[model samples]
Target chain A: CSFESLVDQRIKEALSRQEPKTISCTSVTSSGRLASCPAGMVVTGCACGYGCGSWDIRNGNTCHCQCSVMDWASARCCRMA
Target chain B: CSFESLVDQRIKEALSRQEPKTISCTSVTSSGRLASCPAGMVVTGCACGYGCGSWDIRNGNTCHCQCSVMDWASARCCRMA
Candidate 1:
């Protein structure tokens, strides 16, 4: 699956939660978005945050987003989707 | 698995081909490396090509790598492991 497709899968899984609540998360510097992962899964990695230097892991889950100066940053948390 | 782990899986599959040949491919901007995907798989996406921009798909398999000007480029082709 493509990156977008895997992201879609993650969204599907998140929506499939037993309680089905909208779990929203955020990253520092507005580079990446917080993701709700399924059971037994943790925020393992990230991608698509172009122009950003790297996705920094904070609190073991909050993506401390940062990027090069003047670079527009964006990213998404990822697991085995 | 992490992005690197998936990349390793792709590499293992590439190296495990019949006769196990060393396949090399380059991107437009030298941001990513060409990956030999296992059968039934194609170079569908990429990650870890930091600094540079996105990984461009070429010839349905060749990962035409490109990144922001002046940004160091690096990447790897990915397929289902």
Candidate 2:
């Protein structure tokens, strides 16, 4: 599958042009999106509205979302499918 | 080469319409999947599933997921291949 295949063209342009979004419950910038992640996934991880982290993406950058709340550290390296 | 190359069409549409935001691990909720994440990944974080975050996406809205415990800040960004 392709990375672009997960996201939309407009989002592609928005991410490419606009600032990324993120999820941070403990920090000041509680919301900063990272365009580096592959697309096609849903809002997985929390329900109420806490425990989410923040993100940021740049040219040639990658966003790997981690679901580990205590053990894992990094996300798997992925490419466009 | 394209950001849109990693995400899916539905996700892209959801992100564009919905307002992208942040995530936390102690309050909001669990299972909020990030539309930013590239496709193709498995469940991580706590095994008890108590940390299974949740999410919500709208037409053109993007939802990003995260996994962390301590000694860390946020989930690493990723893109699909």
Candidate 3:
């Protein structure tokens, strides 16, 4: 039931009138890899060092690091949900 | 001498009075991979299917396909020289 619902939700979102855009932006810092999208773009999905991270766009277009190994963080950006 | 010339040319272009911006864009068509830069941007570097292609920005901000394998073409764009 959980898997079915999850698939259904994703399909609905993907085929909805508000299809999201996929974007990836990255930058390397003195500490490690730090990623961020361009101005006005939103982060929808993100993963770093083989660990998955949550995406929250209700407030703004941003994401955080979730790498258990190093200080590097990778993020995914989108126009909308 | 050839390698040295190539390296020198690249370095000269990279660090001239005008610094160039790096941009990579890609698109997949029914034929294969097709890539293009944004509007008003100039194509400086281009390659497709492991073959190095030449870039010409004298005419305008555009490039052409250069793949020995298929109809797919990949190009690199920049803001300016």
Candidate 4:
């Protein structure tokens, strides 16, 4: 069945990854990107990529993005899926 | 009096123009403008131009900036005035 991967180990691994949990960088803008991006920000595509902005890890990979700088609070992109 | 403009209806127009402030796009670098930008994000100088990123409306202009992408929360520059 479609769900037959029932309790798939990947699911378990995915759930385990959720232990960390990330906030959301829901408040970064074009105007503010350059000014606020600290020297520490990883600097990537849209400030939503790994290590680019700010985030931890309580979630699964629902989306793929690239960012240059982001806050350490929330890891959400401007638009969450 | 300098305050004679007190009743300046322009103020009303200006105030009326005020609207929901844009969220701050505080994460970005000179290095991140090439990739992550969605096909839609208005690509302009510093990512914060007219139509590159996301924004609604808000108070009068306290600061001038340019960006490429941003969320929808606070609207403060990486550094607010």
Candidate 5:
């Protein structure tokens, strides 16, 4: 192989030896219907009160519960580390 | 010149060969108020019996249901693969 190909393989192997990627996540809970993750974090899951499992995310960061009596809301926020 | 653009081409070349990021997830269920994920994993969501949707994470690994009828609980766990 040419030097270009040889160098490419070497660089790839070097990268493989570095630390593997990881996932970073956080929790955001609010007393009302909507919970917002801080900027750069995205919502992966949501929880709502009144024994409701139905919920959704707005703009990828805010949790909105779909049930009445939304006394509380929680968001599972995540991003790549 | 010895090498065009001082080898920015080579850097991008190596990066292009890198794999894309991905997520790996699993579910853990248990009786009572708690459900736990394996070591090195974190909770993303939770489920509970008696139509309960209110829950929280303990130390980022365990799901704790807030319902009074917590007959069972489940945790949605995730990490980067």
Candidate 6:
């Protein structure tokens, strides 16, 4: 029977100490309709001025809003924590 | 004094079946500038009609557009994979 034993659990516990992975996120805002996330981070979402809700990601880390009369833009950046 | 080893591997293999954490994501869309993610999923990004780009999250799982008018709203939903 391959039931988890003390030794088996000792190993699993070792992995468990490191297996608690999670995600961390932040929002970056910039003037105008563009915002760029920090290095090693990915853009998961975006927002901008004029109540704009349409956006695109450029170079995978930048958020570009598509609208007229803009003033600000925000990039939702995320990565494993 | 614990370095991962063969005996260590047996338990790791046991846990590997369930501990290789990953992230899964999807987009949920609804009419009139509002969208909600499924239970246990978190909102990571959003989109909407009118080319609007401004939005806010409510209750940690809903995407709410802030524009004057909206026809659709999308919530970028993410969860453990």
All DockQ scores: 0.08, 0.05, 0.01, 0.02, 0.59, 0.46
| Candidate 5 residue runs with Cα over 4 Å from true position | A1-10, A17-19, B1-18
- Compared with the true structure, what per-residue lDDT tens digits does model 3 show for residues A16-46? 7433334344432223334566664444333
After superposition, the stretches of candidate 4 with alpha carbons farther than 4 Å from their true spots are A1-81, B1-3, B6-9, B23-37, B40-81
lDDT of 5 by residue, A1-81 (tens): 677777667677878888887777788989999999998877888888887788989988889988888899989888767
Pick out the ten consecutive residues of candidate 2 chain B with the lowest summed lDDT. B22-31
User: lDDT tens string, model 6, B1-81?
Assistant: 345465666655776786466789989989987799998677888887887668867776788887887799889888777
C-alpha lDDT (0 to 100) for residue A20 of candidate 6: 61
Q: Pick the candidate with the highest DockQ.
A: 5
lDDT, model 2, position A60: 27
Question: What TM-score would you give candidate 2 relative to the actual structure?
Answer: 0.19
Candidates ranked, most accurate by TM-score first: 5, 6, 1, 3, 2, 4
RMSD of 6: 4.2
TM-score of predicted chain B versus true chain B for each candidate: 0.33, 0.16, 0.38, 0.19, 0.83, 0.79
Q: Given candidate 1, what's the lDDT at residue A70? A: 34
Q: Which 10 successive residues of model 3 chain B have the least lDDT summed?
A: B22-31
Model 5, C-alpha of B13: deviation from truth (Å): 6.1
Angstrom error of the Cα, residue B3, model 4: value is 8.3
| Residue clash pairs of candidate 6 | A52-B52, A52-B53, A52-B54, A53-B52, A53-B53, A54-B52
After TM-score superposition, what is the CA distance of residue A60 in candidate 1 from its true location, in Å? 2.3
lDDT, candidate 6, at B42: 71
Candidate 4 accuracy as TM-score: 0.18
DockQ, model 4, C-alpha based? 0.02
